[PDB]
């Protein structure tokens, strides 16, 4: 969160990669950075595609991943060097292996440096590696769900956000958003068929966080009430912020 117009900034399309893994993360007039990713347990693999849109080669093409001081102890990224020479119109691929150590909020920074026509081209963009990517969806009957829902003791483990919808409140879109977010989508848990209930486990090296959630649309008001309940306060916080921005 920064002050000032978010256009041509480091996170123009970051939000579009929270509930889906593929797409074009950034594109200026020389380069297009695409993404393809997959996650399992507390791990993942992200493919980064660098497309040269010009008629000439990029030289000394050097992409670097940067994780803030805290992020680093919570997220582990490993990758191999990319050939510093990218022909015009060509695409070069970089594989990033991901390991989530513990829950985190911050996002890694992708820095790209390269020479074009003899000039220094420098690009920075936030990498859409978010906490919900390490979700293991967990289907369960309504009875099980409520049993688990009422085991919350810590009031801090319950985060509720009442917000204005930033998008049309389409049902099918909303469904896809929740499924894409990562938890399982449980049917017939909330008696009101217009609401959505979710449940899943967030996987990290050191701890497994059980998470429950409830999304309540109010069509006339054009508002939502999202309710998160997990076994870890910081997890409940981060997932609520992430999901809130999607609707």
């Amino acid at each position: 969160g920064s002050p000032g117009i978010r256009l041509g900034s480091s996170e123009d399309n970051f939000a579009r990669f929270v509930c889906k893994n593929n797409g074009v993360l950034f594109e200026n007039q020389l380069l297009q950075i695409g993404l393809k990713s997959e996650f399992r347990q507390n791990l993942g693999r992200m493919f980064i595609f660098y497309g040269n849109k010009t008629s000439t080669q990029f030289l000394n093409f050097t992409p670097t991943l940067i994780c803030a001081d805290d992020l680093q102890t919570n997220l582990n990224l490993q990758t191999k060097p990319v050939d510093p020479t990218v022909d015009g119109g060509a695409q070069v691929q970089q594989v990033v292996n991901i390991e989530c150590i513990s829950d985190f909020t911050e996002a890694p920074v992708l820095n790209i440096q390269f020479r074009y026509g003899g000039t220094f081209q420098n690009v920075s963009v936030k990498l859409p590696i978010t906490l919900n990517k390490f979700f293991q969806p967990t289907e369960m009957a309504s009875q099980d769900f409520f049993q688990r829902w009422k085991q919350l003791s810590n009031p801090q483990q319950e985060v509720q956000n009442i917000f204005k919808a930033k998008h049309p409140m389409d049902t099918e879109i909303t469904k896809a958003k929740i499924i894409g977010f990562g938890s399982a989508l449980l049917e017939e848990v909330d008696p009101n068929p217009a609401n959505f209930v979710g449940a899943g486990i967030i996987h990290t090296k050191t701890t497994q966080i059980g998470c429950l959630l409830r999304l309540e649309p109010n069509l006339q008001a054009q508002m939502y009430r999202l309710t998160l309940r997990t076994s870890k306060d910081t997890v409940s916080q981060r997932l609520c912020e992430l999901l809130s921005e999607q609707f």
Binding site: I162, D190, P191, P217, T227
Partner: peptide, 9 residues
């Protein structure tokens, strides 16, 4: 089912 309360009044 039964959440304690409901957003939509």
């Amino acid at each position: 089912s039964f959440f304690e309360d409901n957003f939509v009044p």
